[PDB]
Design a protein around this nucleic acid. Sequence first.
DNA 1: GCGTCGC
DNA 2: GCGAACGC
Length: 63
Amino acid sequence: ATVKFKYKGEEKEVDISKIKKVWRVGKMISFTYDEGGGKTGRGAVSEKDAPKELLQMLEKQKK
DNA sequence: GCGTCGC
DNA sequence: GCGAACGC
């Protein structure tokens, strides 16, 4: 599955397999993900949006 | 402010 | 150490 979100004026669509860490900030689901060049990207979506795969990671990670 | 990269 | 980023 993929997560769609806008970050710094750019549209992003990241495969959920790449999501590194995920945490909750109120209604915001915030996360980091693996990118090319050994780098780590950041992203956030509304919980309303939030694919269940991503939300499950929260409950199953929270670390 | 809440939770957590790239100077 | 901190500005900026993200939905609210």
